[PDB]
Amino acid sequence: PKSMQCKVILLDGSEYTCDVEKRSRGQVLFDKVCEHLNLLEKDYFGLTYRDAENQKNWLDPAKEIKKQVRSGAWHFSFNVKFYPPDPAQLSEDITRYYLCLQLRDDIVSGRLPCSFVTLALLGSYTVQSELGDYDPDECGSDYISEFRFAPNHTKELEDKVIELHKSHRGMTPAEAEMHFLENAKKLSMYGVDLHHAKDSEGVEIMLGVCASGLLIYRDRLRINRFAWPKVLKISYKRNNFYIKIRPGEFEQFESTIGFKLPNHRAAKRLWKVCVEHHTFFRLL
Ligand SMILES: CC(=O)N[C@H]1CNc2ccccc2C1
Known part of the structure; x- marks a missing residue:
């Protein structure tokens, strides 16, 4: 049974090393790190790994480690998710x-x-x-x-x-x-995950993902906030990220707001972090 060495940077800056079977799902390595840390309230945390452009990606605990890190090193960080x-x-x-x-x-x-x-x-x-x-x-x-x-x-x-x-x-x-x-x-x-984006007119914005909802930082006079309840649906296609905003009472149709992300991977990443926050904070 062939095992791969994993190196995890812990929040005190120290390195934890372990082995997992090479076809292991992310949960296997996460369970090992959390046991090492004596951490029971594990739901708030996850492992990240850096790709070729040194971008952060959450290790999906449900998927094979190898199909996520792909060509990269089995090097991770332990973080608050x-x-x-x-x-x-x-x-x-x-x-x-x-x-x-x-x-x-x-x-x-x-x-x-x-x-x-x-x-x-x-x-x-x-x-x-x-x-x-x-x-x-x-x-x-x-x-x-x-x-x-x-x-x-x-x-x-x-x-x-x-x-x-x-x-x-x-x-x-x-x-x-x-x-x-x-x-x-x-x-x-606090707890705001920031993503670079462009609005439907090509103007540079930031999208913030947090417990309460989605934030659109346009300028210091203009911050749009969509509480999770107001967000009916999230989607990505190509380099685009879309949100479907509920109609106000007595309105016939939802509105759609579209954003341009740098590339397809950045659009997918924003979509998955939004879905995960929406699920987590809907249950909390
Ligand atoms: C005082 C205030 O604006 N509180 C929440 C409300 N709603 C909201 C929606 C999305 C992201 C953040 C937030 C902050």
Whole structure:
């Protein structure tokens, strides 16, 4: 029985290596990673892999690994797939912990934009969770944390992290992680998967996929939002992605909004992430 070596980048930046039978479905490798992580609330998470153009793709747990990675290396990342709108509802602290690690990467990467004060407040909870109570002995007036807090670090941000860290004395890691999530969950780009697209007139937009629905970012004055209930049907054809928007009460016909994606694969990817969010958040 021939087995392939899999390498998984974990959310703490460490590598997990295992073997699966070469005809294995994605669920087989995912179950192994989740057992390694002691993760029970697995529904929020998945494995990603990068293709030739270094684009992210979700490993479909129902399909053969080999038919997805195809010509590529069996190299994956462990990631949050469905960001819970209310992380307090999750049953386990260890679930909230992995969600925190994902969000820390969302912030440092700049996928999740954040004000100065929110960067410092999130960083202060991470430090409280990881080092415990503030200790002056470690930090002088010139202190810079090993922790990455932001896409661009400044001495002013490092100082503000410490000032807020002083206020969290006696906070346990679980408690600091819950405060982290209560702040992060309110950010306008929390849990938003962004896709480059063009509208029916060729104007560059972004489409955002999240728990609540689909967002169309046209300009800073113009953001269209379609709550999942308002979306009757999703489709792709060639490089195009279409959504069928319910008629208002007393209207005869649904409206259709079409978008141009860069290529056929980018249209299919957007379609599948929309279908998965629609199913998940319809049941949650
Ligand atoms: C205050 C607000 O606009 N809340 C939700 C409502 N609806 C909605 C629909 C699609 C994507 C995101 C959202 C955010």
